[PDB]
């Protein structure tokens, strides 16, 4: 069964990880990316997944 579902997300300081309404911790800063030193942010994930 394919499921697409919209959820809320909550991160506390230092914001190097967050949660979801279902209760799943995503181990990556909500601001990690590619633009303007965003690769400085934290992601314990293999860079190919993002």
């Amino acid at each position: 069964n394919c499921i697409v579902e919209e959820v809320d997300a909550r991160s506390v300081y230092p914001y190097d990880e967050f949660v979801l309404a279902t209760g799943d911790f995503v181990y990556m800063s909500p601001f990690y990316g590619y633009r303007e030193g965003s690769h400085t942010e934290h992601t314990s994930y293999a860079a190919d997944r993002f």
């Binding site: 990880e17 949660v19 209760g23 799943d24 911790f25 181990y27 314990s44």
Partner: peptide, 13 residues
């Protein structure tokens, strides 16, 4: 509950 969750969701990594 939150700290328990954060600790227990690090087992694979």
């Amino acid at each position: 509950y939150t700290e328990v969750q954060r600790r227990n969701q690090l087992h694979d990594l």
